[PDB]
Design a protein around this ligand. Sequence first.
Ligand SMILES: Nc1nc2c(ncn2[C@@H]2O[C@H](COP(=O)(O)O)[C@@H](O)[C@H]2O)c(=O)[nH]1
Lengths: 115, 112
Amino acid sequence: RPGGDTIFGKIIRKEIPAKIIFEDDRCLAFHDISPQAPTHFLVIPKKHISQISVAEDDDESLLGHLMIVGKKCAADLGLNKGYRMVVNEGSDGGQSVYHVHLHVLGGRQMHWPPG
Amino acid sequence: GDTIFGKIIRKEIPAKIIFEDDRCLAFHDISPQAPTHFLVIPKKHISQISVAEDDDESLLGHLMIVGKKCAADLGLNKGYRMVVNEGSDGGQSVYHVHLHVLGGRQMHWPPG
Ligand SMILES: Nc1nc2c(ncn2[C@@H]2O[C@H](COP(=O)(O)O)[C@@H](O)[C@H]2O)c(=O)[nH]1
């Protein structure tokens, strides 16, 4: 099955439901099931990449596309005071789903340090 | 307008530079929030991610690829967190878009 069998691969194939914000041929944006801010969503590639540490050089455009889609979705969601984008890599990064994804959090003041 | 990151790019003030190419610069954060905390910034003066253009897509991804290579070179084999802040709610401290890379400790949840 294209995309693998992590939770995110199954969401991509519409096998498990999600609250989808935006979808194109390269990525999917959907709300996080455990939001850490009043608005908290994810932008993920449809191509399965386990983690940023194994991304290829030719994945540059795709990774940038996650950020462009993330900022567009944030504007569409009315996050006019700003937001924070986060990638969690590995154990120290707090990663729990090994399919690359960008968090976008807003709707409140975010604090420093970022965890 | 110009920012302190513009001065760093132009080598007018010092920073602990990790990596440079023709389109970005990576350097340690002067106020580190983790044992390793560095920034990857484009040389193009994009003020904030909310105004990035579609043509900037591969450049933004280049910041992340450079970030993950610098992280490996700095020994962050247990992982790290990448952060881009936008605006006042995002806590953006400098209006020149920059990717934070933090590691060398457990990063926590929520991410601020
Ligand atoms: N929408 C949705 N989000 C999920 C599901 N399972 C896990 N998540 C979210 O995916 C994120 C994984 O990010 P990580 O912890 O790997 O950085 C977490 O914020 C978690 O709440 C799910 O079934 N549906």
